[PDB]
Amino acid sequence: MDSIGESEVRALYKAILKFGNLKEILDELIADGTLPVKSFEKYGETYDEMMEAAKDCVHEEEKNRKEILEKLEKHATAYRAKLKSGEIKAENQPKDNPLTRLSLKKREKKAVLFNFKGVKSLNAESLLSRVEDLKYLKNLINSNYKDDPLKFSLGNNTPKPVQNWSSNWTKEEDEKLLIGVFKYGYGSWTQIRDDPFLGITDKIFLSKKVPGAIHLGRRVDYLLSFLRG
């Protein structure tokens, strides 16, 4: 009757990518069919368990990348030594060599996934970074403009402008966008566009246009990592 299965998990995970830490507002979510009806406490324990599992997954993948880079580094060293000593000619080189290998691995980014309670391919990175980002944003707008989130501003921070977007997109639009993420959650691009108080209806697009959903996500992540440092 109260146990947890897979539907409640998927719904939760999605809700976490949407609102980060949501234990504050579980009720409201249950109260609008966002989450299946279950107890506040049990959802709390499931959330804690999920974030725990994400922490552990990221940890294990970090260990893995570490060891792989150790080995690749060793190979790089032993290769340099041979180039200098002259046992390898520099111009008769294959394009696949310990150097290019160590480099590509150095700069490789890839999904960090895990399974949880019979739900498959959850993104630990997305979960953690989303909780942090949305916490930083909530605290950022509440500590200053609580009685009117719309008056939020970046101050004298000037984030680098957008590249070849189809709408005249300025700092103002960044502010409004962030306010919208604070209001409806990460991903709710339709509600953000349609809110007339934000007044950015004719600057979002869901010859293909720009910016769409993905582009909004990138812009939000960049804006927040920028405002931090």
Add this chain to the structure above:
DNA sequence: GCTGGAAATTTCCAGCG
């Protein structure tokens, strides 16, 4: 199977020597 969204891959582009 099908399909939407995520993930991976490719392409585009600006900044630089």
Add this chain to the structure above:
DNA sequence: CGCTGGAAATTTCCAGC
């Protein structure tokens, strides 16, 4: 010119129906 890093576009992948 080519290199390189970042963003956009394009293709592929996969879980859940």
